[model samples]
Target chain A: GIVEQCCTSICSLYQLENYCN
Target chain B: FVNQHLCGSDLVEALYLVCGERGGFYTKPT
Candidate 1:
């Protein structure tokens, strides 16, 4: 996967906060 | 179930364009 995949997966797990943090 | 784009298809749909899920990516707003 890529940053996109991490973003998506992390998003599903933590929502925007995952990215925000 | 359905998990597809049409992602980044700003011309086809309305809400999807705002969903920000493309190529398994999400646009950050800061």
Candidate 2:
């Protein structure tokens, strides 16, 4: 579940760069 | 698992990455 938090703290942050898009 | 110091420990261990992209999180660098 720790990874899930990183998963939590990541997606929105990563996508903020619009890179994953 | 998280119980103060151990809680911070989770972040420590979890944040550890043997590898990753440049300027992304912390890493040993390639």
Candidate 3:
């Protein structure tokens, strides 16, 4: 799930957001 | 799917945009 991890990292680093809020 | 670098690949542009804004995850300019 590299995409998920990327999204998770990008999202989290950018907005502290995760897969489920 | 993700193992294919969907998030870091060129194909990810659209996906990133959608997912990023889908839930206000990535902060973008208006």
Give one digit per residue, the lDDT tens place, for model 1 in B1-30: 123322233212322233336434444433
Which candidate achieves the best lDDT against the true structure? Answer: 3
Off by over 4 Å in 2: A1-21, B1-6, B18-30
lDDT of 2 by residue, B1-30 (tens): 121221244444434321124336553322
The clash count for each model shown is 0, 0, 0
lDDT of 2 by residue, A1-21 (tens): 443444345433332232212
Higher-TM-score candidate among 1 and 2? 2
Query: Candidate 1 docking: what grade?
Result: incorrect
The per-prediction CA RMSD against the true structure, in angstroms, equals 9.0, 10.2, 8.1
TM-scores of the candidates are: 0.19, 0.23, 0.23
**Candidate 1: RMSD to truth:** 9.0
The local distance difference test score of each candidate is 0.33, 0.34, 0.43
The residue ranges of model 3 lying beyond 4 angstroms of the native Cα positions read A1-21, B1-8, B23-30
Chain A TM-score of each candidate structure, as shown: 0.21, 0.22, 0.21
**Over the stretch B1-30, how does candidate 3's per-residue lDDT look in tens digits?**
233233444324635544665575543423
lDDT of 3 by residue, A1-21 (tens): 435565544433333233324
DockQ of 2: 0.06
Kindly list the interface RMSD, in angstroms, of each predicted candidate in the order they appear. 8.4, 10.0, 7.7
